[PDB]
Amino acid sequence: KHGLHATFMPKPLFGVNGSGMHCNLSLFKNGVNAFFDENADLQLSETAKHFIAGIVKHATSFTAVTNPTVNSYKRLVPGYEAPCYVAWSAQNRSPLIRIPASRGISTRVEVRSVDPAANPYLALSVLLAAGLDGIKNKLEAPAPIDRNIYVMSKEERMENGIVDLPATLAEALEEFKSNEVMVKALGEHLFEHFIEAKEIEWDMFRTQVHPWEREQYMSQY
Amino acid sequence: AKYTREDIEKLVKEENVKYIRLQFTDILGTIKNVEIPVSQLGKALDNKVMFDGSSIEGFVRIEESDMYLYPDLNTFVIFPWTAEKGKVARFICDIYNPDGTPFEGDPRNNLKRILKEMEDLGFSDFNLGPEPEFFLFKLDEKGEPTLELNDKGGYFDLAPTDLGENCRRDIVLELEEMGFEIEASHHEVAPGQHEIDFKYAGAVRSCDDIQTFKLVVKTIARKHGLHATFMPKPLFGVNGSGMHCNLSLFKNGVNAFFDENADLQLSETAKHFIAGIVKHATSFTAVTNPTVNSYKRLVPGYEAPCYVAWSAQNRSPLIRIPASRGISTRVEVRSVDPAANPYLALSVLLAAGLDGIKNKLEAPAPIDRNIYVMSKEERMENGIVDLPATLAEALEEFKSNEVMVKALGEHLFEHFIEAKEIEWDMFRTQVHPWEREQYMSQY
Amino acid sequence: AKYTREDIEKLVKEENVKYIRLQFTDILGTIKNVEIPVSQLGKALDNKVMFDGSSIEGFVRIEESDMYLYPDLNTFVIFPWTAEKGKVARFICDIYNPDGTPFEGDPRNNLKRILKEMEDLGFSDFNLGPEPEFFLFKLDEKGEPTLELNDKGGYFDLAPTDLGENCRRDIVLELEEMGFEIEASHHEVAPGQHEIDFKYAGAVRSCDDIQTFKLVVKTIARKHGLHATFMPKPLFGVNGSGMHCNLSLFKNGVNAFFDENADLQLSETAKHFIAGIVKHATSFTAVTNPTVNSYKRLVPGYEAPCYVAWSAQNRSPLIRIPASRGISTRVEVRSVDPAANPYLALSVLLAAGLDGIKNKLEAPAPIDRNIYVMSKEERMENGIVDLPATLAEALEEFKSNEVMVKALGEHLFEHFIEAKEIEWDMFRTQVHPWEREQYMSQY
Numbered sequence A: 001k002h003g004l005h006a007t008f009m010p011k012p013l014f015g016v017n018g019s020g021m022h023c024n025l026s027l028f029k030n031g032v033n034a035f036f037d038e039n040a041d042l043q044l045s046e047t048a049k050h051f052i053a054g055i056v057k058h059a060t061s062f063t064a065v066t067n068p069t070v071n072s073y074k075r076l077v078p079g080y081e082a083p084c085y086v087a088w089s090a091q092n093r094s095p096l097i098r099i100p101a102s103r104g105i106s107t108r109v110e111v112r113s114v115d116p117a118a119n120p121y122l123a124l125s126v127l128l129a130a131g132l133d134g135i136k137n138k139l140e141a142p143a144p145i146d147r148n149i150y151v152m153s154k155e156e157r158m159e160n161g162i163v164d165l166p167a168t169l170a171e172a173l174e175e176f177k178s179n180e181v182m183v184k185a186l187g188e189h190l191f192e193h194f195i196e197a198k199e200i201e202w203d204m205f206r207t208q209v210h211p212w213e214r215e216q217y218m219s220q221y
Numbered sequence B, C: 001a002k003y004t005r006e007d008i009e010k011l012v013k014e015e016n017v018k019y020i021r022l023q024f025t026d027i028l029g030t031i032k033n034v035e036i037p038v039s040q041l042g043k044a045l046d047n048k049v050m051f052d053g054s055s056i057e058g059f060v061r062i063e064e065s066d067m068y069l070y071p072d073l074n075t076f077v078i079f080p081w082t083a084e085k086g087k088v089a090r091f092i093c094d095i096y097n098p099d100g101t102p103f104e105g106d107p108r109n110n111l112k113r114i115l116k117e118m119e120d121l122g123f124s125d126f127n128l129g130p131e132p133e134f135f136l137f138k139l140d141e142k143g144e145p146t147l148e149l150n151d152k153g154g155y156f157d158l159a160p161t162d163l164g165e166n167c168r169r170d171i172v173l174e175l176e177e178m179g180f181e182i183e184a185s186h187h188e189v190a191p192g193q194h195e196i197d198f199k200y201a202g203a204v205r206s207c208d209d210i211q212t213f214k215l216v217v218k219t220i221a222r223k224h225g226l227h228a229t230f231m232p233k234p235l236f237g238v239n240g241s242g243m244h245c246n247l248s249l250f251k252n253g254v255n256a257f258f259d260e261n262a263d264l265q266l267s268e269t270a271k272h273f274i275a276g277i278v279k280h281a282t283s284f285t286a287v288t289n290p291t292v293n294s295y296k297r298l299v300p301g302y303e304a305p306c307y308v309a310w311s312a313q314n315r316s317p318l319i320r321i322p323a324s325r326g327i328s329t330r331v332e333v334r335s336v337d338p339a340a341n342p343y344l345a346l347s348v349l350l351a352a353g354l355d356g357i358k359n360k361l362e363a364p365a366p367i368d369r370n371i372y373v374m375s376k377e378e379r380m381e382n383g384i385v386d387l388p389a390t391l392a393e394a395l396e397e398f399k400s401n402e403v404m405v406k407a408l409g410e411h412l413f414e415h416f417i418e419a420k421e422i423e424w425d426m427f428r429t430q431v432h433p434w435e436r437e438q439y440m441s442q443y
């Protein structure tokens, strides 16, 4: 209408910000927030600590659904208000599961990973499933790294509960396939059609020979 | 008070106001706002609209730190430009941490506190009349500014024929509908340059009015297919845009600078006040003059204060006590520019006068002579020290001074220095077009 | 000698030399000269060729003062390049006041001094190995320099194909048939950048050789439809051409730094010569890097120092020292860029040795660990100092330094400051494209 093209492409332009879509999740139980707890550490129930605890496990694995494009990972590059590291905090630069100070009903766990490219319906499927799997198995949340994580070396990060996310989409898939809780969250039909379609998407991209590939190699080599 | 909480509510309803702009101010003086739909008005007024407070620290941003927005009801205003669905309103706000307390990094809350230091000395008002100047360019096809100035007028010319554009005339019209108290408005020295002047007002009251100006300018400019800018020295060879600042300290409703019973007709309060604005001058220019370009305006020649002196008639008399007296007895500081953060620039001048008066400082002689006329030695024979000449020189002056640093204090002072150090560095590390025309062959 | 006056005549006749160039050097190292036909050679060798010496001030010249041109017979050269009327020859000459005394503001007669000030301290020779880097750009249709790099080569690469262009090879062969003792060359870090190192030589012959490099390069470059330049930082964000200076002091024909039996393999003369250079570097920076642009190369990360200290290895150290000993014992100063006047760079560098050797000063810890790593609160906490960032920093810093001020001697000095102050003023008063693009919209 205003003679424009709005887009939800994670990283339209190399070297400028990328559009990501945070997801503030809160589980109610009888109409009230099940994470809140004015009398547990940090102000979060054992439901909360557990819901986080599950999300940490499978993030690496539900990445191939929250960030579905090859381009999605051209945004998950350190420095663009976009995570790379699996862990929760109170503050933090670009944390993966930062948690807002606000409590009450407004008790909730933000997942800053997702970009506007993910299918709204599947992003939530997979995220609920990595809570319900954490709440079920009663898993336990690691150290809420409150100190900056972009600072620590690859030999200072992964030495704690700190994990990198997949770098290429094909990393994310191989990684997503091998994960019973997510594989089951979507259910055979959705899953296999997803892999295929996605494997098709990567193949197309790897078999292309980009302008970069010439300009870095047409003379030098 | 100027508006009841019920006063705001009624206006909206009967006024079809459909969108709220909770505006405030990042450190560089940029106009910030988080907006909300009219349906979230309660949430605003009850001061519970939250946001990433780190936007105030401009580009030096590290973390996401949630923070509150407390609307000053008196600031409330409605713009004559309607959407296709509803009029829009605005709210100048204060920033609070999540613990109900002021955010120290907020320049708005940083002036409210240097105004208090004022009260801790008895005064009731510190009034402020700004003489903010600007340029108007033409917009090419896409909508970018070119460097084609809007008009070929000069100093005070009747300078744009009334029938036609008149961005100046048409701004000063929309400003008066928004409830502004415009004094006058002429056409300044360079072609395409324009000035509009304000009636005095409470410091923070007028700062709020210096954000609203800059905002209504750049909007109406655009509307006339033009591009208004507040860059100090947009062009070499031409004038530079200034923002002289007419200042005065009232006590119990009475101008404390005045005294029809003392030399020069100036209360001994005033003489002191003046005293301190000179001591700190070099040390507070980095705030009144934030940008690299600002110093391309402080080259002696285009009537811009190069010299730390207090006269009434001079070519770059940094300080100037104009004709008028009585109520309107005030010091003029002719070296600010439009880019200066108002809230800050003001806190830094006060803290200057204040430490001045507070420590009873001994004012120098008014160099009635034309200062410009002499060599730096002849200018050194008296109290003529020229200003910092580069953003670095000005930023070193600043840090070395202690009273200007409590004027902004830890947080503000800490983030300003960083943003500015990066900015200069960016400019110094750069290789400019000039260096190639000047060197690529010569060497 | 190298050429008797008899030989000189033997060569002009027999080689059909029809045009002569009495070459000299002004305050900024620009190659100046005066063009007399061969039918007028005698007058020259007799030292009677008058000329306007105010030209040695370059652009700050004032009044036309008379000066005499005394040639250095050893400098006699004939370029392969002949107008179709006959060949061309040259002479590097000393500018001599008309009364017969050497002009003291002349750059070649001012190092001839600091060598006699070295001679008057025991040493026989001050030697020099220069590593002069230059860029190559394509000349457009009009014969204008464009920012086109002649090739996209890289560090030590096999620069332009042999059959194809290879302009660097050519420059070297033309210098082989001119009696230039060149050691070896390569292609430099950036695209189109080049380097060509000669064997070492006595301060004066090495500069004579320097100056004459620059001319033949520029010239062999136009021949191949190119513009070679010695501009420290032609392009923002790519390498900058700097010119290292490998200094070694002889004393009775042998290296006075070597010592196979002192720590590190350096005498106390060496430790001391370094010790002096550290002191004044910050201060002789305004002469080794004379352009505003020079400092657009002294930005961390471009194989160019910023930090005052010596090492054995190190990334971009300021006084790295090559492992090689023997005669090849020497102290490289990596600071200098090809923009500095060859004659003044050496003046000032010899003076910060002789002042270190004299006062017997002591060299600080040879920081062998990387220095770019340490924080500003980890570097300057040791013997590690930043160099000046802007040229105006370098000057204010260079003025205030008796040992350098005296190294050049009143005449050269004050004309230098002025001319330089003029250069900075021009630059600070310009309003660059950057200044608009960072401020024309944002503000």
Ligand SMILES: Nc1ncnc2c1ncn2[C@@H]1O[C@H](COP(=O)(O)OP(=O)(O)O)[C@@H](O)[C@H]1O
Pocket (backbone or CB within 6 Å): B127, B128, B129, B130, B183, B197, B198, B199, B200, B246, B247, B248, B249, B255, B322, B324, B325, B327, B328, B329, B330
């Ligand atoms: N109490 C005050 N404090 C600060 N500035 C003032 C005050 N009174 C007047 N001014 C400013 O002084 C400037 C000079 O205008 P002038 O016509 O002399 O003022 P007035 O008519 O109010 O005496 C005006 O721009 C105005 O904003």
Ligand SMILES: Nc1ncnc2c1ncn2[C@@H]1O[C@H](COP(=O)(O)OP(=O)(O)O)[C@@H](O)[C@H]1O
Pocket (backbone or CB within 6 Å): C127, C128, C129, C130, C131, C183, C197, C198, C199, C200, C246, C247, C248, C322, C324, C327, C328, C329, C330
């Ligand atoms: N005795 C000397 N004094 C000063 N500089 C020298 C000396 N000998 C060589 N140089 C210079 O030092 C530079 C470094 O080259 P390098 O290969 O280390 O020299 P060498 O092989 O002679 O030890 C050369 O560019 C050369 O011009």
Ligand SMILES: N[C@@H](CCC(=O)O)C(=O)O
Pocket (backbone or CB within 6 Å): A017, A018, A019, A020, A021, A022, A075, A080, A081, A082, A083, A112
């Ligand atoms: N769009 C960014 C966050 C930056 C912001 O919202 O300011 C991301 O999550 O990748």
Ligand SMILES: N[C@@H](CCC(=O)O)C(=O)O
Pocket (backbone or CB within 6 Å): B133, B188, B189, B239, B240, B241, B242, B243, B297, B302, B303, B304, B305, B334, B335
């Ligand atoms: N550069 C001018 C702006 C004001 C004017 O044009 O009068 C000054 O500071 O004096």
Ligand SMILES: N[C@@H](CCC(=O)O)C(=O)O
Pocket (backbone or CB within 6 Å): C133, C188, C189, C239, C240, C241, C242, C243, C244, C297, C302, C303, C304, C305, C334
């Ligand atoms: N030209 C660089 C050094 C890089 C090199 O020679 O490879 C400098 O001294 O600034």
Ligand SMILES: [Mg+2]
Pocket (backbone or CB within 6 Å): A022
């Ligand atoms: Mg958020």
Ligand SMILES: [Mg+2]
Pocket (backbone or CB within 6 Å): B131, B195
């Ligand atoms: Mg004015």
Ligand SMILES: [Mg+2]
Pocket (backbone or CB within 6 Å): B131, B244
């Ligand atoms: Mg005025």
Ligand SMILES: [Mg+2]
Pocket (backbone or CB within 6 Å): C131, C195
């Ligand atoms: Mg090299």
Ligand SMILES: [Mg+2]
Pocket (backbone or CB within 6 Å): C131, C244
């Ligand atoms: Mg070297």
